[PDB]
């Protein structure tokens, strides 16, 4: 794969969202970090690629956000320790890296996770994520100039 090597390939935005997802799992306890735990924090955070795509395609960001929170509520609780990465998140991490690397990128942004999730809609279980799965990666590839113009996932200068 491998798990630790994939994480260092994440950009600042996605890494912060996963850290915040890990913090939440630790408090909710919450055995593993699922893509939904991460997607929740990605939306929660900013005007990231998902927020920009959400706007230009008009997604009920409230419903998605609400749907995610409701799913995370039906997540088995055990002991408030420190969490593992779910098989679904581990697989998403590998597919998103495959999407990012092929595009000549150095880091994985939320649109690469969306590109991975688009050809792998089974990695997510939460029903309210269907607007995220309406896009194709040929489409998301074309939308790159728009994403650099409005998203916090912005490289520098």
């Amino acid at each position: 794969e491998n798990s630790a090597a994939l994480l260092r390939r994440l950009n600042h935005y996605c890494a912060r969202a996963l850290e915040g997802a890990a913090s939440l799992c630790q408090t909710r306890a919450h055995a593993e970090i699922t893509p939904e735990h991460w997607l929740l924090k990605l939306l929660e955070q900013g005007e990231g690629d998902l927020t920009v795509l959400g706007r230009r395609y008009d997604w009920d960001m409230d419903a998605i956000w609400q749907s995610l929170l409701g799913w995370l509520d039906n997540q088995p609780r055990s002991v408030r320790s420190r969490p593992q990465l779910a098989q679904s998140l581990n697989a998403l991490l590998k597919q998103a890296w495959m999407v990012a690397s092929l595009q000549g990128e150095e880091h994985i942004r939320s649109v690469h996770l969306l590109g991975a999730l688009t050809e792998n809609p089974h990695l997510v279980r939460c029903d309210g994520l269907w607007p995220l799965l309406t896009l194709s990666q040929s489409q998301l590839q074309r939308l790159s100039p728009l994403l650099d113009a409005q998203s916090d996932e912005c490289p520098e200068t």
Partner: peptide, 14 residues
């Protein structure tokens, strides 16, 4: 070698 990648790593690889 980010100050922030380490903070993420703090959490459970197994």
């Amino acid at each position: 070698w980010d100050s922030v990648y380490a903070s993420l790593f703090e959490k459970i690889n197994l």
